[PDB]
Design a protein around this ligand. Structure first.
Ligand SMILES: NC(=O)c1ccc[n+]([C@@H]2O[C@H](COP(=O)([O-])OP(=O)(O)OC[C@H]3O[C@@H](n4cnc5c(N)ncnc54)[C@H](OP(=O)(O)O)[C@@H]3O)[C@@H](O)[C@H]2O)c1
Ligand SMILES: CCc1nc(N)nc(N)c1C#CCc1cc(-c2ccc(C(=O)O)cc2)ccc1OC
Length: 157
């Protein structure tokens, strides 16, 4: 299974200055639950922003850098390498990976951040006429999670 995993705002902002524009612990938990025990594929910039591989899952980084060799991280140098990865693979950003993979993935796990943030990187436009809403769940708000958000699972029609 090949899935997109992404949080984007009302205008499809996903990032600003190589970081997430929002602070939303519940979505990090969401990511943790979906991807633990499986595989995350991310572009080089996304990886460097995180700084270290995420625990308890396979971390795969796409880069043209032949010198890239980080402990706890597998490297790939081509999009086509993704298709050789076994198991449930999540395309985990950033903008370049999403643009390169959105027409190839089976489904998308999207957290819609229900606000308008300043961004410099975007999720590509998509239409619900191409995607069935398998599920849509409002995120619960609290003291630590104050931005409204919705968890979508979309499956390609
Ligand atoms: N909101 C979210 O769910 C979410 C999730 C992930 C990331 N983000 C955000 O996304 C932003 C980063 O996105 P970005 O587009 O700037 O960078 P990115 O996609 O994370 O990384 C781009 C790099 O990936 C490598 N790459 C991509 N395609 C390749 C290919 N076909 N062959 C070889 N290498 C390839 C290249 O690395 P080299 O230059 O080293 O060759 C390229 O420079 C950040 O702001 C981050 O916070 C948001
Ligand atoms: C966690 C935000 C997010 N949500 C959803 N639904 N899909 C994604 N692909 C990402 C993402 C991402 C990349 C990223 C993750 C993190 C991050 C931080 C903490 C945790 C964690 O505590 O589990 C996970 C990812 C930090 C920075 C960062 O890019 C700047």
């Amino acid at each position: 299974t090949l899935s997109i995993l992404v949080a984007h705002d009302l205008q499809r902002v996903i990032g600003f200055e190589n970081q997430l524009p929002w602070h939303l612990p519940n979505d990090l938990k969401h990511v943790k639950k979906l991807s633990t025990g499986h595989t995350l594929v991310m572009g080089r910039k996304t990886f460097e922003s995180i700084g270290k591989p995420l625990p308890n899952r396979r971390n795969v980084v796409l880069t043209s850098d032949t010198s890239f060799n980080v402990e706890g991280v597998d490297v790939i140098h081509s999009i086509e390498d993704i298709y050789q990865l076994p198991g449930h693979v999540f395309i985990f950003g950033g903008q370049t990976l999403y643009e390169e993979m959105i027409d190839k993935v089976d489904d998308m796990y999207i957290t819609v951040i229900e606000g308008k943030f300043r961004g410099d990187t975007f999720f590509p436009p998509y239409t619900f006429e191409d995607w069935e809403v398998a599920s849509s769940v409002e995120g619960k708000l609290d003291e630590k999670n104050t931005i409204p958000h919705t968890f979508l699972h979309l499956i390609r029609k």
